[PDB]
């Protein structure tokens, strides 16, 4: 249940927590951070991050108006996604597209990918989390926990609900790994 997830994320019933800091590699080679890092290029360099996935692409108060050419000639491969951190959102419409990029990302041998959003708390962890499930055979309670353990995160219940569905596509296709 999404409730099953809420509790993984809280600290009892009720308290989710917030990022003690702007960027955290939540899994080897894969980093989840916020707007600033994304827009602080000499850091992405020292971080040796080579790919960006802006999962909150746009110009509203809840988006990062970065874009391809913004990353041109510091040579960082870019991929944008105009998502909305609201329960309505079907972020689960970009799972493949995203995972497919994270995979190409990792394939280089010194490949480091920064999946990010505004706060690096919902839209972002969500993609990343979905990549572990269909790409590392992990069940939902699992990826959440790794990711969660590595960064303080909190996806909206819609996004939560989207992952569970994902869980049973996989689980019932025997794509899991119990």
């Amino acid at each position: 249940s999404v409730q099953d997830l809420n509790d993984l994320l809280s600290d009892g019933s009720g308290c989710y927590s917030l990022p003690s800091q702007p960027c955290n590699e939540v899994t080897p080679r894969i980093y989840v951070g916020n707007a600033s890092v994304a827009q602080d290029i000499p850091k992405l360099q020292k971080l040796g991050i080579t790919h960006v996935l802006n999962a909150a692409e746009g110009r509203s108060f809840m988006h990062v108006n970065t874009n391809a050419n913004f990353y041109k000639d510091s040579g960082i491969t870019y991929l944008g996604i105009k998502a909305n951190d609201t329960q309505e959102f079907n972020l689960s419409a970009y799972f493949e597209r995203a995972a497919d990029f994270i995979d190409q990302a990792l394939a280089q041998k010194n490949g480091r990918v920064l999946v990010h959003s505004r706060e690096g708390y919902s839209r972002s962890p969500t993609l990343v989390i979905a990549y572990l499930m269909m790409r590392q055979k992990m069940d939902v309670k699992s990826a959440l926990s790794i990711v969660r353990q590595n960064r303080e995160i909190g996806p909206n219940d819609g996004f939560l609900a989207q992952l569970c569905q994902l869980n049973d596509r996989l689980a019932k296709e025997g794509k899991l790994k119990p």
């Binding site: 809420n6 989710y16 917030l18 990022p19 003690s20 800091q21 702007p22 916020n34 951190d85 329960q87 505004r118 706060e119 708390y121 919902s122 995160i153 909190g154 996806p155 909206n156 219940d157 819609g158 996004f159 939560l160």
Partner: peptide, 11 residues
């Protein structure tokens, strides 16, 4: 170092 930052409350 380590700041509090924000935001996610999922309704």
């Amino acid at each position: 170092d380590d700041e509090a930052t924000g935001y996610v409350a999922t309704r």
